[PDB]
Design a protein around this ligand. Sequence first.
Ligand SMILES: Nc1nc(Nc2ccc(S(N)(=O)=O)cc2)nn1C(=O)c1c(F)cccc1F
Ligand SMILES: O=C(O)c1cc(-c2cccc(Br)c2)nc2ccccc12
Length: 257
Amino acid sequence: QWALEDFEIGRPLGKGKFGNVYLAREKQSKFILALKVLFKAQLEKAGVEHQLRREVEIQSHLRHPNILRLYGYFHDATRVYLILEYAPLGTVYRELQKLSKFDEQRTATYITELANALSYCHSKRVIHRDIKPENLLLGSAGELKIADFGWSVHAPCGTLDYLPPEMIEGRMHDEKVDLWSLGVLCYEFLVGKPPFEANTYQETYKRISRVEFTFPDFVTEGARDLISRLLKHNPSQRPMLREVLEHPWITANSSKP
Ligand SMILES: Nc1nc(Nc2ccc(S(N)(=O)=O)cc2)nn1C(=O)c1c(F)cccc1F
Ligand SMILES: O=C(O)c1cc(-c2cccc(Br)c2)nc2ccccc12
């Protein structure tokens, strides 16, 4: 079905994290795509073979314009190869480094595209558990695409910044975990840093478990209301995705087709 001889490999798009992503082209069709090349050595040492197979299994079945497509996979005696959609405008992470912070318009748009992808995800019982700017890509029209379904699973670690209390405490969690992540993102998009950031993991753990965030002066009340409602300790007290898409701050600042 698939072999390395089928593609022409090009420029690096990112680095592992175990393995790199390279720009590539399929020889037969001239189809431009991105090839993630993971090493079996590193994958064994971390014990993630079951998790990656699980990721590929989940990600290959999903179809949404705000979820990055996986077209297929293959492997060699030494490496596993993933055939991904190439997002031409890069990471939201790099966008945010360039502008420092986003305006309400861009943020509300990104949150709408994000909630939509999550409604679709939850409607197949899949919970991402890992939304963060480095895992969000931008298509050719500047539309947001979710990328790394590695730590995803059916409902109901590096930096803790995006994880909710119930997760960092090891408590049972379900779909409402992604609602927290949205609030963290909405905060970081407007402020330029996540709300429980810190110089140490131990402090970030304290900050999250206690829900210790303050808003800078430029954050408007509509944004302060949506963020505050999302950043609740109690998962059942977080709103639904419907409620988020219909929030007055969102509806007054987002975009549509
Ligand atoms: N699938 C995919 N497409 C892209 N497009 C891309 C990425 C970076 C740039 S650039 N020159 O650094 O600004 C330009 C285009 N990245 N990508 C990935 O899987 C990917 C990822 F998810 C995280 C990190 C790196 C990646 F490569
Ligand atoms: O040597 C193998 O047979 C092997 C295969 C794979 C593999 C094969 C196909 C798809 C995916 Br995802 C992963 N992952 C590994 C991950 C670690 C070690 C070995 C492997």
